[PDB]
Amino acid sequence: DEITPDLWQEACWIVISSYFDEKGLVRQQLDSFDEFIQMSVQRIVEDAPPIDLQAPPRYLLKFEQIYLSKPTHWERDGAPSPMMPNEARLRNLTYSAPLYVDITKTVIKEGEEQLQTQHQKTFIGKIPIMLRSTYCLLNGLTDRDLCELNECPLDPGGYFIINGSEKVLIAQEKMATNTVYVFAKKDSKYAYTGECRSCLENSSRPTSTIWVSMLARGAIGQRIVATLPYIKQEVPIIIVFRALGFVSDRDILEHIIYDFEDPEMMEMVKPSLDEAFVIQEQNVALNFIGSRGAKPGVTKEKRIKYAKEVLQKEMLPHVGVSDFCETKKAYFLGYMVHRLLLAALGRRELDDRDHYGNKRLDLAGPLLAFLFRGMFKNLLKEVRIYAQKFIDRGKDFNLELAIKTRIISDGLKYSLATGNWGDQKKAHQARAGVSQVLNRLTFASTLSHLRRLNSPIGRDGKLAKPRQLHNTLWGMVCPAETPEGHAVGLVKNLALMAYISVGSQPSPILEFLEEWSMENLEEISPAAIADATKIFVNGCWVGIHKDPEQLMNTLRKLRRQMDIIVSEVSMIRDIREREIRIYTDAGRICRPLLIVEKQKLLLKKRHIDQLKEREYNNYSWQDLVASGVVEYIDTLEEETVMLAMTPDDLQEKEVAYCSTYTHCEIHPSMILGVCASIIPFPDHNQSPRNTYQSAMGKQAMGVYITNFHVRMDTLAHVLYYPQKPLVTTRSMEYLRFRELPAGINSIVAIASYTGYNQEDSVIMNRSAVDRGFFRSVFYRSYKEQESKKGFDQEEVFEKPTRETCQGMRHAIYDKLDDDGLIAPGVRVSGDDVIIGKTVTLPRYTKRDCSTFLRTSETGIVDQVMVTLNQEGYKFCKIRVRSVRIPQIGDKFASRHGQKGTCGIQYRQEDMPFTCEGITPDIIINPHAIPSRMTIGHLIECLQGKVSANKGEIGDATPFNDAVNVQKISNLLSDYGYHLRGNEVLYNGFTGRKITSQIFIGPTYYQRLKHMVDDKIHSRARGPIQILNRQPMEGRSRDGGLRFGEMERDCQIAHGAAQFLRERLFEASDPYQVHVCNLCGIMAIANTRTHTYECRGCRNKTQISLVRMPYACKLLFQELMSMSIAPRMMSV
Amino acid sequence: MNAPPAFESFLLFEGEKKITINKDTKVPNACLFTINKEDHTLGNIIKSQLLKDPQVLFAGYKVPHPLEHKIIIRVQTTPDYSPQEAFTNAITDLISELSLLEERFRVAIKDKQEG
Amino acid sequence: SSVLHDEFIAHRLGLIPLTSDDIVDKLQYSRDCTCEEFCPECSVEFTLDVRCNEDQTRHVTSRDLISNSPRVIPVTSRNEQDDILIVKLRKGQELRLRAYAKKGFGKEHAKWNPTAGVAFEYDPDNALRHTVYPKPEEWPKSEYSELDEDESQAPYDPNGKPERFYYNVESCGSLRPETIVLSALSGLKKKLSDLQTQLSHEIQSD
Amino acid sequence: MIIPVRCFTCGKIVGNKWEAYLGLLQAEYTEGDALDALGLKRYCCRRMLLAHVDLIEKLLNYAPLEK
Amino acid sequence: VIFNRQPTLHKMSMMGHRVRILPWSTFRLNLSVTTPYNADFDGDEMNLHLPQSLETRAEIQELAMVPRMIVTPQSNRPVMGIVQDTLTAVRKFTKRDVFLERGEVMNLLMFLSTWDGKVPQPAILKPRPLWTGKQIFSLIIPGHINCIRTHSTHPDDEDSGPYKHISPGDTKVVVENGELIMGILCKKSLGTSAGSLVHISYLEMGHDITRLFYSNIQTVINNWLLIEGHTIGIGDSIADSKTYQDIQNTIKKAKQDVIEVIEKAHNNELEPTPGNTLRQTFENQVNRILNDARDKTGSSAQKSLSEYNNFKSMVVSGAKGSKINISQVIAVVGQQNVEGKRIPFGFKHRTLPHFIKDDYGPESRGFVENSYLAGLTPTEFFFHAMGGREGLIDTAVKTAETGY
Amino acid sequence: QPMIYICGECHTENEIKSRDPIRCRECGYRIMYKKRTKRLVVFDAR
Amino acid sequence: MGKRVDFSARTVITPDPNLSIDQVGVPRSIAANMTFAEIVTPFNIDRLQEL
Ligand SMILES: [Mg+2]
Ligand SMILES: [Zn+2]
Ligand SMILES: [Zn+2]
Ligand SMILES: [Zn+2]
Ligand SMILES: [Zn+2]
């Protein structure tokens, strides 16, 4: 029955494999989008108010149902055919499906003359579709079906195709809503502040933040204030309580202080009462609120109405926005004050801003919902204006012409295309970085980009606290994978078994709590709240309970049985403070864990047995979760959980550590993400090395996707001979690194050989490189289109001619065909022409606008595709193919942060060799190891020697006590090798033995995208910028290198004044001006007629020539634009 | 972009001499032999054969740059001898050694295939 | 029409070993040939023409490299070991090409390297102490060692020099291993002879 | 994508061994014994056969450009 | 040309070079001139500027050329020195038991540019002629400079007792009349510190002679290292069973000591020291215990090393690494700190959900009792990732403020 | 002169002249590919 | 204070133990792109005509 330790390493990984058979790696994206389409769009459409318009006749126009068909593309002819994602990629279409809404317009004029007209399936917009979602044409297709459609079966999906560009929505971090968080700002007028970003269940407005603060000590005592929304002045809490109908101080403290035996709380609230005694009735308090507001009505009536509306709608919407909710709002605001007092009295800890239990991940669904709310509101507005301008004339109108569908369509398309998350007009208030271009450089880069999280703290911020690896990231975020540049700690990555909750309605839970012995908050007396336990659901205090323990037992039983409580519902019992917080909302990152009985796992051997035959008896992960054996625990419920790292922790020990565990890790290696799960032996490296590899696995070459032959990507690198690593971890089985690997096993020798590998460089074998070692192919796609925008000027693909075309370069166009497009198989060098495009003029009647190769490439045309774009003019894509043979300067890396460029390449006779004539493919310098402490590199090399000599794949899973260095060495000594991986090598040049026995063996190396040929650049008098006549910027522009301020300072320190003048004047922008010797302002010179005159001074004899930079002339002219007179006085 | 053709390691450029002899002025009876389009394969054997001559006081070689395709062999001999004569005799001795080794390897192969 | 681009196929064809035993001495380098781009005195013509019409995958192997010279053929195609795989083709895919094989050696490209490993060793017992084992007991014995198992390395020989070099020359297939050794000795001797000729011209010109 | 022709390290031909290697593996050989049957004794050539991923078999799941 | 690397921090980040045209498509640099640029070859790119007049060319040739840039005015010492392979190898080369044969010596003399063509009389004439590494470095050393240094392993109690001028360990570098009379050369003798051989060469001999000195050290030593070789592998990370037992006993004793301090604090048997609160005093005691454990285990690992250990070779030469790195690879990685304190209670009174609440023990709060060869446990792995994230954040955040 | 293209879906060789919408005559598919040139490109098998 | 300049080049750096400290190894393509305006004289008339 029990899984014994000897079977555990199989059982756990069997369980893990079942998880990845059920979910995958992009499950969060697909589930978010599916919830958005199934629920969020319908909720948004129904939550909009019916637009009642009347001059008389009236019309309501109620939207009642939505229909999202499959993605479809319509041609000029109008025939209807399904649009496949690959066709969208090739034709630069948007993989979107039409959204139709049912509309009901009832005519009501008078005399009960009512009649309803329903417009079924009114086309309301187009919604882009996430690939492999339920509403994707690739849904449920087999691998054969996907290959029939020219799709990769290993492609995870989880992205959109907007204008042929694959866009991926990055999950955005945000502070959780409807939760009270008591912080303390050191530099502020308030000692403690308790904030609550409140938002109603079905979002319709932004988060309304309410603060309840305490004024810092230094009138008599500490005063509690409340910064309500839409009010620009602090308001005492007692005033707010009275404005809600609680005038008696006893009632207010009944709502705030639940234990009247506690004078400390009492004296700390007393200043607030003493400050609010002149106001003692609800109307006067409402008048005070309205007066403190930023729109103080001259008459107290409208002041009181405004205060009523604010306190009913903007104050704590999550508690309830309807009327008669003042009791719930009063209880909740009293809870906020109670929490603030507990913090000020030291009875509760301040809340941690960085705790991921306090955060939420805004995924594709809830982000598209924000867009859709804004866009549907704008659409209903436009419909209101259109219908108003017609009914004002007293006649009917056609809603089909009122609905301008471009709002929703173009809005979603623009937002996903650019990443600016918001309305196109508010292009600066909008937050960019959402919806990035999917990284297709290697399969690991694609997976990681699809599992990418973002902390929008702002890269400019230099506070390290949000960048720090918090304790609560354990199991939810990769500890290693993070960019090492300016976004350290802000851009994160999901751990492998991390699941972001999609969201759920609290209705069944609330109904069960009602049927259960919970007492509502309006029905109780406050005297009961002392000993009772509060119950919050999605932040709303809904009631109280008397035995929280058996309530938690009941709820956990219900969630483990897949009863009314779904698996993703978090249920935290804080014991010391008697809250029970239940969460069903979306964005809660959680992970699966094995539940533990008294001191035993519930995962018995029968579950492993049924999981082994997963493909026959359809016993899956969901059956494991439904059995009550596995549980999803979120960051906030982990605080109440006692984990076992392994079932070995559940053994009874000579001194028991815990003996009351509640859960167990499925495997600790699941704390790593996609790119860190490729590192072998990451627990033997320094952690920065693991981070650098997690970044560098994403630039590694491989086969980024199986269907690369049909993709017209702008840039693509494919390795000739990708190999799976000889030394692998058990997590790559689910990353599909074995099916799409990104490196080669290289016989690497760590040695000092000729000095060409010093300081992070490598010596490669020229003979190996000749045999296809780390050879790659580079595919570059050029796009072009001939626009017939108007009869004024039209472009067209056609072989240009020297007699008709004007802007025709001296490059030869013979490689083009009569259609103007080069043919595949044609070898093209730099500056060559691949598309001959000519544009009609207003060298006559047509000018050359041909597409050249990006300079200095020298490839062969791989293929040419011609089609029609969305509007329907001819559209061409040409993929050119360039074989990249590794060379000096190309960057290579192992899986341990050990990067370096090729210093030199030696032939096989020049490389050092073992007694059996094995030469290293790569030689790396021993000095790269000691400071870096990448012992995982050495253990991987030794394990790889054992694996190659044994005919297996080494197990480098991080935390594995069945694999240590002594075992690997003992294994290697059985194959006739030195047990530590050393060998006697001979000098290739002289054949003499090397005195020091070299450490050599197979290690998995990666070829990175950074090849020297894509970086080398030179300039000598090339093109210049228009504004300031200085060299351009970039290799692509043939630009010059920037001689910056620091270079100026260095050369000033050198004392090199002529070199400094050469760099900053003569090699950048030499120029001449003519200055009036009297006024010092630039004069008018006419060198052809030799007439120089200053219009200002009315002189034409006292002019002087001045040699100045063009940028300085431009500066002085831009100062004269500002009415400044910079007078260059030559005397 | 900058890859030299692989034959440039073996083939002489037009007007480029296979070997150049330059008198070393630091010490007497020393010469520098700059041999183009050769590498350690001939340099090592020529040096080691020259070291077998008791009339050779110095015999060394270097590949000044691996990316370049020449070697320099410095030979100093006793005053009654010459570095050019030493170099010639070293090549003659290497040729005779290789001829003998080839004939003996042919004989050994014949014995092995026959019995 | 195969799934491997043209340079992939070309590179892959270059690495197929061709029987070179008696023909390599007769052929000339195209540098030395007085012909045009090609001729039968400096090159060998190959042709390959395969089309997958049937439903199973067609393995375009080195057996499909048809030569004009019967003496120079792919090693695997010589009259066991299977044929080298050039490319797998799907129904409707087709590969038709025309190759020319030339004379060269491993300095120019590893495809002209005739060896599949050259094991070279000397002083199997570390008597010259050209290696210094920190723990001589930890190291396995060479196959050419003559030491009793208690003895880890031979006693140090102060008057010793490297003699008795052991070789294991494995052939890729193009040449016989003994032909590799004989051709190596002849090539080294002709390198030295050419060097001596140029040396004599330099000495007499001075 | 396809089995290399030569071993990158020594230059031994491995191109003719992938199919035989797979046939030995379905014959219930261990990978080590299979590599021994094909004569791959240096761990470089064993690396070549043992770490190869036959991606061409997946690229042949797509219909060609011409029928 | 002027050769530059960004960020251009000081005047040595832009130096004058003479162009040497070479086949492939990278900028090829000498390895001594990498420290001034702060340049390594992990994908770094550098900028070449070509002066376009005879006046600017003369300016750069007389002011900014690299040999004129050997000594920096910032700290009146060399800015470039001997570096990784050449430094490990010159340390191994100038050891007392390095004996070169006639052919090896001639091979090395081929790579001396400043060689008068006279083979020096070997240090050993019989039974077999043998030159020493010091005897060849004496030929590399220019002029008649005089220098006294001490190898990094020089015992501090040797200059007092006898054998001061005849060092048993071949420490106490002494160069006289441009001959390395004795001592093992290392970072202290050929690095960028003040009073080293490269500095004294620049001060006594010109910048040209010093340029040749740098080049000759590099060429001769690299071509000798082709014979000697240098490596690193698992065998250098391993220690003997006695050392492992000593380290584990040290760690066990340290954990029991921390348990004793915890028990004292729990029983109110701990009184605070002046200037600190009780929490801070407990933290000081625990951190002192664990730092003592780390240092003792590191000393155990360091003494366990042999003379053939390659970690010890690179640390001794000063080429790369430190004794703390050896301790972390062999003995114990040690305490992980976030903001200068132990791992914070990021959960509620816990560092991770795997620990009990209020657990101030060493493993709970981030003491990695394993080495990098042993491998970190999952909690040690996460805490080490936290500590390393602190360094990454510091490196990425200090740059803007320091540049401003 | 003819500029025959191949269909991305039906793989049909069909001729299309300039100023013609890009449509396969056999199935109407909108994506077409050019055929391999007849020019003689040479590869050094290296 | 800082600006783009002509006669500049940039590429990856690489080790070269066989250069002196004051040398820089330059590709032939960078050197073929970059030029130095040398004045003609009877001292260099022949060499510059050759170039
Ligand atoms: Mg760098
Ligand atoms: Zn004027
Ligand atoms: Zn010919
Ligand atoms: Zn091999
Ligand atoms: Zn068609």
Coordinates of C-alpha atoms in Angstrom, one line a residue, chain E residues 74-376:
Chain E
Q74 CA 45.7 56.8 -10.0
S75 CA 47.7 54.6 -7.6
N76 CA 51.3 54.9 -8.8
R77 CA 51.5 51.2 -9.8
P78 CA 51.1 49.1 -13.0
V79 CA 47.6 48.9 -14.4
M80 CA 48.4 45.8 -16.5
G81 CA 50.3 42.8 -15.2
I82 CA 50.7 39.1 -16.0
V83 CA 47.4 37.3 -16.1
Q84 CA 45.7 33.9 -16.0
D85 CA 47.7 31.2 -17.9
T86 CA 50.9 33.1 -17.9
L87 CA 50.6 33.7 -14.1
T88 CA 49.7 30.2 -13.1
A89 CA 52.5 29.0 -15.5
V90 CA 55.2 31.4 -14.3
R91 CA 54.4 30.3 -10.7
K92 CA 54.9 26.7 -11.8
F93 CA 57.9 27.6 -13.9
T94 CA 59.9 29.4 -11.2
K95 CA 59.5 26.6 -8.7
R96 CA 62.7 25.2 -7.5
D97 CA 62.3 21.8 -9.2
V98 CA 61.7 23.0 -12.7
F99 CA 64.5 21.6 -14.9
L100 CA 64.6 22.2 -18.6
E101 CA 66.4 20.0 -21.2
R102 CA 68.6 21.4 -24.0
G103 CA 65.9 21.1 -26.7
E104 CA 63.2 22.5 -24.4
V105 CA 65.4 25.5 -23.5
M106 CA 66.1 26.2 -27.2
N107 CA 62.4 26.0 -27.9
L108 CA 61.8 28.6 -25.2
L109 CA 64.6 30.8 -26.4
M110 CA 63.0 30.9 -29.8
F111 CA 60.3 33.0 -28.2
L112 CA 62.5 35.6 -26.6
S113 CA 62.5 38.7 -28.7
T114 CA 65.2 40.3 -26.4
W115 CA 67.7 37.5 -26.6
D116 CA 71.4 38.0 -27.3
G117 CA 71.7 34.6 -28.9
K118 CA 73.9 33.2 -26.1
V119 CA 72.7 30.1 -24.5
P120 CA 73.3 30.4 -20.7
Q121 CA 75.5 27.9 -18.9
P122 CA 73.0 25.4 -17.4
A123 CA 72.5 25.4 -13.7
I124 CA 73.2 21.6 -13.7
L125 CA 76.1 20.3 -15.9
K126 CA 76.3 16.7 -14.7
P127 CA 75.0 14.0 -14.8
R128 CA 72.9 15.7 -17.5
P129 CA 72.7 19.4 -18.6
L130 CA 69.6 21.0 -17.2
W131 CA 68.5 24.6 -17.1
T132 CA 66.1 25.9 -14.5
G133 CA 63.0 28.0 -15.0
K134 CA 64.5 30.8 -13.0
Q135 CA 67.6 30.6 -15.3
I136 CA 65.3 31.3 -18.3
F137 CA 63.2 33.9 -16.6
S138 CA 66.5 35.6 -15.8
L139 CA 66.9 36.0 -19.5
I140 CA 63.4 37.3 -19.8
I141 CA 64.0 39.9 -17.1
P142 CA 65.3 43.1 -18.7
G143 CA 68.2 45.3 -17.9
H144 CA 69.9 45.0 -14.5
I145 CA 66.8 45.6 -12.3
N146 CA 66.9 44.6 -8.6
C147 CA 63.8 43.5 -6.8
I148 CA 62.8 41.8 -3.5
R149 CA 59.3 40.3 -3.2
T150 CA 57.7 37.4 -1.3
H151 CA 55.6 34.6 -2.8
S152 CA 52.1 34.5 -1.4
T153 CA 52.8 31.3 0.5
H154 CA 55.8 32.9 2.2
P155 CA 55.5 32.0 6.0
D156 CA 55.6 35.0 8.2
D157 CA 58.0 33.4 10.7
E158 CA 60.7 32.7 8.2
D159 CA 62.3 36.1 8.0
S160 CA 63.0 35.9 11.7
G161 CA 64.6 32.5 12.1
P162 CA 67.5 31.1 10.2
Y163 CA 67.3 30.4 6.4
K164 CA 66.2 34.0 5.8
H165 CA 68.4 34.2 2.7
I166 CA 68.1 30.5 1.8
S167 CA 64.4 29.9 1.8
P168 CA 63.2 26.3 2.3
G169 CA 60.0 27.0 0.4
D170 CA 61.6 29.0 -2.4
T171 CA 59.6 32.0 -1.4
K172 CA 61.3 35.5 -0.9
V173 CA 61.8 36.5 -4.5
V174 CA 65.2 38.1 -5.2
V175 CA 66.1 39.5 -8.6
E176 CA 69.7 40.9 -8.8
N177 CA 71.3 42.4 -11.9
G178 CA 68.3 41.2 -13.9
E179 CA 68.7 37.6 -12.8
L180 CA 66.0 35.8 -10.8
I181 CA 68.4 34.7 -8.0
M182 CA 65.6 33.0 -6.2
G183 CA 61.9 32.7 -5.4
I184 CA 58.6 31.7 -7.0
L185 CA 57.1 34.5 -9.1
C186 CA 53.4 35.2 -8.7
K187 CA 50.8 38.0 -8.6
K188 CA 53.0 39.7 -6.0
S189 CA 55.9 39.8 -8.4
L190 CA 54.4 40.2 -11.8
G191 CA 50.9 41.6 -11.1
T192 CA 49.6 45.1 -10.9
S193 CA 50.8 45.9 -7.3
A194 CA 53.4 48.5 -6.4
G195 CA 57.1 47.5 -6.4
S196 CA 56.6 44.4 -8.5
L197 CA 59.0 43.4 -11.3
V198 CA 56.9 45.0 -14.0
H199 CA 56.7 48.2 -12.0
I200 CA 60.4 48.3 -11.3
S201 CA 61.1 47.4 -15.0
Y202 CA 59.0 50.4 -16.0
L203 CA 60.7 52.7 -13.6
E204 CA 64.3 51.7 -14.2
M205 CA 64.0 50.6 -17.8
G206 CA 61.8 52.5 -20.2
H207 CA 58.4 51.8 -21.5
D208 CA 59.7 50.0 -24.6
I209 CA 61.8 47.6 -22.6
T210 CA 58.9 46.9 -20.3
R211 CA 56.6 46.3 -23.3
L212 CA 59.1 43.7 -24.5
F213 CA 59.3 42.3 -21.0
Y214 CA 55.5 41.7 -20.9
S215 CA 55.5 40.1 -24.4
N216 CA 58.5 37.9 -23.6
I217 CA 57.0 36.6 -20.4
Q218 CA 53.8 35.7 -22.1
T219 CA 55.4 34.0 -25.1
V220 CA 58.0 32.0 -23.3
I221 CA 55.7 31.0 -20.5
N222 CA 52.8 30.0 -22.8
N223 CA 55.2 27.9 -24.9
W224 CA 56.5 26.2 -21.8
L225 CA 53.0 25.6 -20.5
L226 CA 52.5 23.7 -23.7
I227 CA 54.8 21.2 -22.1
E228 CA 53.8 21.5 -18.5
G229 CA 50.0 22.0 -19.1
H230 CA 47.5 23.3 -16.6
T231 CA 44.0 22.0 -16.0
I232 CA 41.3 21.6 -13.4
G233 CA 38.8 18.8 -12.7
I234 CA 36.8 16.8 -10.2
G235 CA 40.0 15.5 -8.6
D236 CA 40.9 19.0 -7.5
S237 CA 37.5 19.5 -5.8
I238 CA 37.8 16.2 -3.8
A239 CA 39.3 15.9 -0.4
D240 CA 40.4 12.8 1.6
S241 CA 38.1 10.9 4.0
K242 CA 40.0 12.4 7.0
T243 CA 39.3 15.9 5.8
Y244 CA 35.6 15.2 5.2
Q245 CA 35.3 13.7 8.6
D246 CA 37.0 16.7 10.2
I247 CA 34.7 19.1 8.3
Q248 CA 31.5 17.2 9.2
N249 CA 32.6 17.1 12.9
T250 CA 33.2 20.8 12.8
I251 CA 29.8 21.4 11.3
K252 CA 28.1 19.1 13.8
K253 CA 29.8 20.8 16.7
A254 CA 28.8 24.2 15.3
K255 CA 25.2 23.2 14.9
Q256 CA 25.2 21.9 18.5
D257 CA 26.7 25.2 19.6
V258 CA 24.0 27.1 17.9
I259 CA 21.4 24.8 19.5
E260 CA 22.9 25.6 22.9
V261 CA 22.7 29.4 22.2
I262 CA 19.1 28.9 21.1
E263 CA 18.3 27.0 24.2
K264 CA 19.9 29.7 26.3
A265 CA 17.9 32.4 24.6
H266 CA 14.7 30.3 25.0
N267 CA 15.3 30.0 28.7
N268 CA 16.1 33.7 29.2
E269 CA 19.6 32.5 30.2
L270 CA 21.1 35.0 27.7
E271 CA 21.8 38.6 28.7
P272 CA 22.4 41.3 26.1
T273 CA 25.8 42.9 25.6
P274 CA 26.3 46.7 25.7
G275 CA 25.2 48.4 22.5
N276 CA 22.8 45.7 21.3
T277 CA 19.3 44.4 21.9
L278 CA 18.8 40.8 22.9
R279 CA 17.8 39.8 19.4
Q280 CA 20.9 41.4 18.0
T281 CA 23.1 39.7 20.6
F282 CA 21.7 36.3 19.8
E283 CA 22.2 37.0 16.1
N284 CA 25.8 38.0 16.8
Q285 CA 26.5 34.9 18.8
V286 CA 25.0 32.6 16.2
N287 CA 26.7 34.3 13.3
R288 CA 30.0 34.2 15.2
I289 CA 29.6 30.4 15.8
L290 CA 28.8 29.8 12.1
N291 CA 31.5 32.0 10.8
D292 CA 34.0 30.2 13.1
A293 CA 32.6 26.9 11.7
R294 CA 33.1 28.1 8.1
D295 CA 36.6 29.3 8.8
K296 CA 37.6 26.2 10.6
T297 CA 36.2 23.9 7.8
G298 CA 37.9 26.1 5.2
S299 CA 41.2 25.8 6.9
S300 CA 40.7 22.0 7.1
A301 CA 40.1 21.9 3.3
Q302 CA 43.0 24.2 2.6
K303 CA 45.4 22.1 4.6
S304 CA 44.1 18.9 2.9
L305 CA 45.2 20.2 -0.5
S306 CA 48.2 18.7 -2.2
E307 CA 50.9 20.5 -4.2
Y308 CA 49.4 19.1 -7.4
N309 CA 45.9 20.6 -6.7
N310 CA 45.0 23.0 -9.5
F311 CA 42.7 25.1 -7.4
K312 CA 45.6 25.7 -5.1
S313 CA 47.8 26.3 -8.1
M314 CA 45.6 29.1 -9.4
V315 CA 45.0 30.6 -6.0
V316 CA 48.8 30.5 -5.1
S317 CA 49.8 32.2 -8.4
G318 CA 47.0 34.7 -7.9
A319 CA 45.8 34.0 -11.4
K320 CA 42.2 33.3 -10.3
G321 CA 40.2 32.3 -7.3
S322 CA 40.7 32.6 -3.5
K323 CA 40.9 30.4 -0.5
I324 CA 37.2 31.1 0.2
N325 CA 36.3 29.6 -3.2
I326 CA 38.3 26.5 -2.4
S327 CA 36.5 26.3 1.0
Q328 CA 33.1 26.6 -0.7
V329 CA 34.0 24.0 -3.3
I330 CA 35.5 21.5 -0.9
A331 CA 34.3 22.2 2.6
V332 CA 31.1 24.3 3.0
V333 CA 29.4 27.0 1.2
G334 CA 28.3 28.7 4.4
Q335 CA 25.9 31.3 5.5
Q336 CA 23.6 33.0 2.9
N337 CA 22.8 36.6 3.8
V338 CA 20.1 39.0 2.5
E339 CA 20.9 42.6 3.3
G340 CA 23.6 41.6 5.7
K341 CA 21.4 39.4 7.8
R342 CA 20.4 35.8 7.8
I343 CA 17.6 34.7 5.6
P344 CA 14.5 36.7 6.6
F345 CA 11.2 35.1 7.8
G346 CA 9.4 35.8 4.5
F347 CA 6.6 33.4 5.6
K348 CA 4.9 33.9 9.0
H349 CA 7.8 33.3 11.4
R350 CA 9.4 31.0 8.9
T351 CA 11.9 31.2 6.1
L352 CA 10.2 28.4 4.2
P353 CA 7.1 26.2 4.7
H354 CA 9.4 23.3 5.3
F355 CA 10.5 24.6 8.7
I356 CA 8.7 25.0 12.0
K357 CA 7.7 28.4 13.2
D358 CA 10.4 30.3 15.2
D359 CA 13.3 28.2 14.1
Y360 CA 16.5 30.2 14.5
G361 CA 18.7 27.2 13.8
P362 CA 21.5 27.4 11.2
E363 CA 19.8 25.4 8.4
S364 CA 16.5 27.2 8.9
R365 CA 18.0 30.6 8.4
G366 CA 20.3 29.9 5.5
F367 CA 23.5 28.1 6.5
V368 CA 24.6 25.9 3.6
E369 CA 26.4 23.1 5.4
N370 CA 27.2 21.4 2.0
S371 CA 30.0 22.2 -0.5
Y372 CA 29.4 22.8 -4.2
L373 CA 30.8 19.3 -4.9
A374 CA 28.5 17.8 -2.2
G375 CA 25.6 19.7 -3.7
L376 CA 23.0 21.9 -2.0

